């Protein structure tokens, strides 16, 4: 729900227009522009920047119950960053193995 509300408020925020009426169009925001172009990144990366970080997993495979609620704009606290280091080091270790 948070990712859908974030994608709605980023895709169609440009509404201040003229010459017919107050009209609506796709937004000229640069983060949405470099996401919708297929240039660098995807909707998962935009969700981690603006919406919610999501549910991060333990190295034992099981998903932790409480998720990382803060994004990379409001800034994580200490315990959420220490939880995120699990998946970051796991992905970096997995990449070398493959």
């Amino acid at each position: 729900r948070v990712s859908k509300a974030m994608m709605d408020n980023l895709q169609t925020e440009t509404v201040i227009n003229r010459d017919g009426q107050e009209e609506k169009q796709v937004s000229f925001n640069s983060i949405y522009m470099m996401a919708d172009s297929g240039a660098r990144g995807s909707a998962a990366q935009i969700r981690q920047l603006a919406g919610m970080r999501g549910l991060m997993a333990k190295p034992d495979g099981s998903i932790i119950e409480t998720p990382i609620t803060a994004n990379f704009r409001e800034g994580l606290n200490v315990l959420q960053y220490f939880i995120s280091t699990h998946g970051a080091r796991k992905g970096l270790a997995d990449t070398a193995l493959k």
């Binding site: 983060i31 920047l49 606290n77 200490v78 699990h86 080091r89 796991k90 270790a93 193995l97």
Partner: protein, 1340 residues
């Protein structure tokens, strides 16, 4: 604030009041090596521990022994910088007093026979420098701490290795500190096994039979007994009621007259409560229940005398009948369930084929040493000396503590070897683990891993050398002479010195120090490498040890590790993490008391952290009151959850304790992704120090701690007033209260100027303090290589725009303006040492002279008459540095040739020239020439000039020392003269040097005057013999390698400007490579006119998720806005009061900031000096995880009269037009990494070739060719370029005839191909034929 803190105050945006100062960051290596050196005779540490664990040693008979008395470390011959120049180990000689006591065999105890003691010089252990480094063979090394598994006992289980069954196989293991291992385990058939030293398996009761146990004592130790009683042809069962839990009644358990259980019914918990409240004991039982149970003890008949039924046999109806007619009226029986009491020892006893103790020892012998014929005494000695010997098995502090904690004992000390009770308790705990009571241990828990630091590893290697020497001394004492044999003729100093030099020079952990900047030095000393001798590898390391365990919170950084194949093996130590007495890792914590967060601090290990509940550092406080919210966030038992504000028992000491040093120098760490923060913290250790270091505008406040405690600057030991500031030395006069009356009170801080480092960068110490300035204790006087006024300054902060620019910043690339190259911002110094050795050949010595044949003025225009390049002569590639020529004829002569030499003369005999030339591409001015020679070889004019300059400098230094010493003694004679009498004017109406002939009538103060005159004469005497010793040391030659006359060392100082190709990086993992230097007229300028210095790429923000670079950009824009306002106020020279008002307005801006600076204390000169230091920008301290917010950033931007969105309207400098969108402009702190394109670029046409395969060599240093690997051969096969593949495997490679004809054909214009068979295939044919297998090329 200090007086060097009031020069420039970094504004701190933090909100947490820090209660604990950041400790000394090099405390682990200093404390461990100080415990290794220093004499601790009770709590034995290091050398005293090794001496008392080896000595004393008797002979094989026992009539001769060496008693250890004491030891003392000698003084080092050379100092630290002298050892680094001369290229020798900085070590102190070890002298030990060892007493020889002879025992008499004629007397029963003939102790008083001969007492002989002396100082046996053995071993030269190296010493640590004051900043944590060793100097081994000239170079500078750092011995990395090791995270190995602690000694003790570790229960574990493979989670379903048997893919057919799926069962869990629990296994024990007893890991000692030194000795053979021991492993108990289960099989799929549920029998207990033993693998001593990871050998073949045995049944686990065979080691119990080796411990002198029968079946009786084994069953009585492990299992508990149920009793069966035979009375009047019925079976009476003794029954305690707590045994029918979870089992099914096989028969009707009844009473005397009461019915409890029925047939086919579970004896439930209500029936258990019924049994224990009626309290019946004797329960009858029919005969079919005995069939299935086993018997505890043996039963021999009193009449016959033979064993009716022995121990651990299957009881049945016929054996029950035999026992009842024999007359053993009490039957003892094991207890066996399927839930809580499993029959494991009984099944293992039925499998076990041994009989008794000697057969058990023979089978243990046949396992350990197979193929040997066993006997009784060898088996007894083997099983004793594997485990129960004080010399071949040892845990002795940490293994015994972990043993008694994992087995729930009480004493944290005891014996250092195993025991019968110890092995029995390990087997009992493993059986309880298999049953279900208890839980197995994890291996990556930091209560099981332990830091084995430098002093501990050096003590172990010293003990290995001591074991070799004590073996040799035992061999000498058991046979040789006893009376006239001094101990220093026996004890050889070779094995101890060889072992300790091998560890300190060529181990896997004593590695070359990466010291290209102070951050890399401090993060190489705070490093915990899990590899090494007795650790993991890169093959035996899966994702269990590499990944982050939740007990690393505070002890080990999760975001500082190499991103290659060492991704979890090389872990960096955190900031606040100390080290326990046993070696474990512990962190500070704020102990709370009834909700009040008390300032007292407890150090908690990794086992004690999992007990309590610990609050997160980001909880708010009511000015030393209680918590604010009711549901505070906390962590407990390794997981994070929520708790009430009264249940919490501990709080984190600071928000910086989770990270390392290099990961806490990054601003806005919480907004970055963890991968990019990892790469940024790894690249900050490779920043080359530039020409003029400049502070970061957006820092953390950790930079001051790193710059002080890195051991690279010159902090003031005692505060005072500086008396003489030079570019080479600082002379400071101490304050009066911090001065003892013994010394003069003048400190001379010499500064090392342009000393080569390990990574070929420069080390110079520019002073920052001015002449006549009061500095206190602990202020940075001389900025190091990359420091600015005591703050760490690894790079330069320049104006950065975030926009795509015409393709020149495509994928991470960086476009740099011409201002960065014109102002010489990123141009560093690369001092490179070239060395020319002069050998001693078999035809004559190699002379260094300017009489070089077959060379001209174009190469000898820079050499002098001695054959050595002038200091300051800019040389290029190919120019001769040191003129050296080897003789090709002969030099030695006979007296026949002596008389004929007087007749005729000499010859040339100097044909072969091997002069030292500059390698190609290297340039730069010579800055130092150091000519070491050997004692015996006569020097030359250049060598005498070097010794003359060194003698004059040393004479001036010691004359300054003599001057301050006579000044101190004159102050002392003035003090005792005023203490004796009242004499003020007559002392200074006469010159200060003529203060000795003054006197009065003879008294006790006259006697003090004469002995002070005697001290005056001996000060001059020790001065002149120190002068003689310094003169003798610089006159004599160094003892060089055998066959080496003299060694010349030339230092070239290249200056490396940036160019297209040079790597650059920020702090947030946004590395790049300079693709173009774009002119200042083409760079985009804003409305004011200032051109952008670096145009970045904005597409690295979403795909990498590093928002810290954009926040640092905005905060740097605000910082330089305030700095330009102060610079405009200083350029217009408005008012000191207006400057003070604006500076206080900019400092008192945050919402709830920690620091508070008031300028009412500040005078006029301090405010003017602060504005002068803030005219280049106002520095900002943004702490990790508690830094500045967007509200404070926008408030700072609205103060500095800037656009609050952070983006300005950049005009295109190339075409004049305006960009259609606002572009983010702001100052980013850019580094310059050590990957230079001058060192990366390489090419080869045709050079040297290998000798075995005759294909070209590999490497830029030896002019190598690029490898055309297996992947590229497949790519050419995929293309179908068969001709390109043939000419890249034959004529550009190992085929001499084909490549020579190819070279001649390319020179002669005709590009034709003359192929042939390569020579690696012929190497392959000859190697298979040398294996003995006929392989031939069958023609047609």
């Amino acid at each position: 604030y200090s007086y060097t803190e009031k020069k420039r105050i970094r504004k701190d945006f933090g909100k947490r009041p820090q209660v604990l100062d950041v400790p000394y960051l090099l405390s682990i290596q200093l404390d461990s090596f100080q415990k290794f050196i220093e004499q601790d005779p009770e709590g034995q540490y290091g050398l005293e521990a090794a001496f008392r664990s080896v000595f004393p040693i008797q002979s094989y008979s026992g009539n001769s022994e060496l008693q250890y008395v004491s030891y003392r470390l000698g003084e080092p011959v050379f100092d630290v910088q002298e050892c680094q120049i001369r290229g020798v180990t900085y070590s102190a000689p070890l002298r030990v007093k060892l007493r020889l006591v002879i025992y008499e065999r004629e007397a029963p105890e003939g102790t008083v026979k001969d007492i002989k003691e002396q100082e046996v010089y053995m071993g030269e252990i190296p010493l640590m420098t004051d900043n944590g480094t060793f100097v081994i063979n000239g170079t500078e090394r750092v011995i990395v701490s090791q995270l190995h598994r602690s000694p003790g006992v570790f229960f574990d289980s493979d989670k379903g290795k048997t893919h057919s069954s799926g069962k869990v196989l629990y296994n024990a293991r007893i890991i000692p500190y030194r000795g053979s291992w021991l492993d108990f385990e289960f099989d799929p058939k549920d029998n207990l096994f033993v693998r001593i030293d990871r050998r073949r398996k045995l049944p686990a009761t065979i080691i119990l039979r080796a411990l002198n146990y029968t079946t009786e004592q084994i069953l009585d130790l492990f299992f508990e007994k149920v009793i069966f009683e035979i009375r009047d042809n019925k079976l009476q069962m003794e029954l305690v009621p707590e045994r029918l839990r979870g089992e099914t009644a096989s028969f009707d358990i009844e009473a005397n007259g009461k019915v409890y259980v029925e047939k086919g019914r579970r004896i439930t918990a209500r029936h258990i409560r019924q049994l224990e409240k009626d309290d019946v004991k004797l329960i009858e039982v029919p005969v079919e229940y005995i069939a299935g149970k086993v018997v505890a003890k043996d039963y021999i008949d009193e009449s016959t005398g033979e064993l009716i039924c022995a121990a651990n046999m299957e009881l049945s109806l016929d054996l029950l009948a035999k026992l009842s007619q024999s007359g053993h009226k009490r039957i003892e029986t094991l207890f066996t369930n399927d839930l809580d009491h499993g029959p494991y020892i009984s099944e293992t006893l039925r499998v076990d084929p041994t009989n008794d103790r000697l057969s058990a020892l023979v089978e243990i012998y046949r396992m350990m040493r197979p193929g040997e014929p066993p006997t009784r005494e060898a088996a007894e000695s083997l099983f004793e000396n594997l485990f129960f010997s004080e010399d071949r098995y040892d845990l002795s502090a940490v293994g015994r503590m972990k043993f008694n904690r994992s087995l729930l004992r009480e004493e944290i000390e005891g014996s250092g070897i195993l025991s019968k009770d110890d092995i029995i308790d390990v087997m009992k705990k493993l059986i309880d683990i298999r049953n279900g009571k208890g839980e197995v241990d994890d291996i990556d828990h930091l209560g099981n891993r332990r830091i084995r630091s430098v002093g501990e590893m050096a003590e172990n290697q010293f003990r290995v050398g001591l074991v070799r020497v004590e073996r040799a001394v035992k061999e000498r004492l058991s046979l040789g002479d006893l009376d006239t044999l001094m101990p220093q003729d026996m004890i050889n100093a070779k094995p101890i010195s060889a072992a300790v030099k091998e560890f300190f020079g060529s181990s896997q952990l004593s590695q070359f120090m990466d010291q290209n900047n102070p951050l890399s030095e401090i993060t190489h000393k705070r490093r915990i490498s899990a590899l090494g001798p007795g650790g993991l590898t890169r093959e035996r390391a899966g994702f269990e040890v590499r990944d982050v365990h939740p007990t690393h919170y505070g002890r080990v950084c999760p975001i500082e590790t190499p991103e290659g194949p060492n991704i979890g093996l090389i872990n960096s130590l955190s900031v606040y993490a100390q080290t326990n007495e046993y070696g474990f890792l512990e962190t500070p914590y704020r102990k709370v008391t009834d909700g009040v967060v008390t300032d007292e601090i407890h150090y908690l290990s990794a086992i004690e952290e999992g007990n309590y509940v610990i609050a997160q550092a980001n909880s708010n406080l009511d000015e030393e009151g209680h918590f604010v919210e009711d549901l505070v966030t906390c962590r407990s038992k390794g997981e994070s959850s929520l708790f009430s504000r009264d249940q919490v028992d501990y709080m984190d000491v600071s928000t910086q304790q989770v990270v390392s040093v290099g990961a806490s120098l990054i601003p806005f760490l919480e907004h970055d992704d963890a991968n990019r923060a990892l790469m940024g913290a790894n690249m900050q250790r490779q920043a080359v120090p530039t020409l003029r270091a400049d502070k970061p505008l957006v820092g953390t406040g950790m930079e001051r701690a790193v710059a002080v405690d890195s051991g690279v600057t010159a902090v003031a030991k005692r505060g005072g007033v500086v008396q003489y500031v030079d570019a080479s030395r600082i002379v400071i006069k101490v304050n009066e209260d911090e001065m003892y009356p013994g010394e003069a009170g003048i400190d001379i801080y010499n500064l090392t100027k342009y000393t080569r480092s390990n990574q070929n960068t420069c080390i110079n110490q520019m002073p920052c303090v001015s002449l006549g300035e009061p500095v206190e204790r602990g202020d940075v006087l001389a900025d190091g290589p990359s420091t600015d006024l005591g703050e760490l300054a690894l790079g330069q902060n320049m104006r950065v725009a975030f926009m795509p620019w015409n393709g020149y910043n495509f994928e991470d690339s960086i476009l740099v303006s011409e201002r960065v190259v014109q102002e010489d911002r990123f141009t560093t110094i690369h001092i490179q040492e070239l060395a020319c050795v002069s050998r001693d050949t078999k035809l004559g010595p190699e002379e260094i002279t300017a009489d070089i044949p077959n060379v001209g003025e174009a190469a000898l225009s820079k050499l002098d008459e001695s054959g050595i390049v002038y200091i300051g002569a800019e040389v290029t590639g190919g120019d001769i540095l040191v003129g050296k020529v080897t003789p090709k004829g002969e030099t030695q002569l006979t007296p026949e040739e002596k008389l004929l030499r007087a007749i005729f003369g000499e010859k040339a005999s100097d044909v072969k020239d091997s002069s030292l030339r500059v390698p190609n591409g290297v340039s730069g001015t010579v800055i130092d020439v150091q000519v070491f020679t050997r004692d015996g070889v006569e020097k030359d004019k250049r060598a005498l000039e070097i010794e003359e300059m060194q003698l004059k400098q040393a004479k001036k230094d010691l004359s300054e020392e003599l001057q301050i010493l006579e000044a101190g003694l004159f102050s002392r004679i003035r003090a005792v003269l005023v203490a004796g009498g009242v004499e003020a004017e007559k002392l200074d109406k006469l010159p200060r040097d003529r203060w000795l002939e003054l006197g009065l009538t003879d008294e006790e103060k006259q006697n003090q005057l004469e002995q002070l005159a005697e001290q005056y004469d001996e000060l001059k005497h020790e001065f002149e013999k120190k002068l003689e010793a310094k003169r003798r040391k610089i006159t004599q030659g160094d003892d060089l390698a055998p066959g080496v006359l003299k060694i010349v060392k030339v230092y070239l100082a290249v200056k490396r400007r940036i160019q297209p190709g040079d790597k650059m990086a920020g702090r947030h993992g946004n590395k790049g490579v300079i693709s173009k230097i774009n002119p200042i007229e083409d760079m985009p300028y804003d409305e004011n006119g200032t051109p952008v210095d670096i145009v970045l790429n904005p597409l690295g923000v979403p795909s990498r998720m590093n928002i810290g670079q954009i926040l640092e950009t905005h905060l740097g824009m605000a910082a330089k806005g305030i700095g330009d306002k102060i610079n405009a106020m200083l350029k217009q020279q408005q008012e000191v009061a207006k400057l003070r008002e604006f500076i206080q307005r900019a400092y008192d801006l945050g919402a709830d900031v920690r620091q508070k600076v008031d300028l009412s204390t500040f005078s006029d000169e301090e405010v003017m000096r602060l504005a002068e230091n803030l005219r280049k920008g106002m520095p900002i301290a943004t702490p990790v995880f508690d830094g500045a917010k967007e509200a404070e950033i926008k408030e700072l931007l609205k103060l500095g009269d800037l656009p609050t969105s952070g983006q300005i309207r950049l005009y295109d400098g190339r075409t004049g037009e305006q960009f259609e969108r606002p572009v983010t402009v702001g100052y980013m702190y850019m580094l310059k990494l050590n990957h230079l394109v001058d060192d990366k670029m390489h090419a080869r046409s045709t050079g040297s070739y290998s000798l075995v395969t005759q294909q070209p060599l590999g490497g830029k240093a030896q002019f190598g060719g690029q490898r055309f690997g297996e992947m590229e051969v497949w790519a050419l096969e995929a293309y179908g370029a068969a001709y390109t593949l043939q000419e890249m495997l034959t004529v550009k490679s190992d085929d001499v005839n084909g490549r020579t004809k190819m070279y001649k054909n390319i020179v002669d214009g005709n590009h034709q191909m003359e192929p042939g068979m390569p020579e690696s295939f012929n190497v392959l044919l000859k190697e298979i034929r040398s294996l003995g297998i006929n392989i031939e090329l069958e023609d047609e």
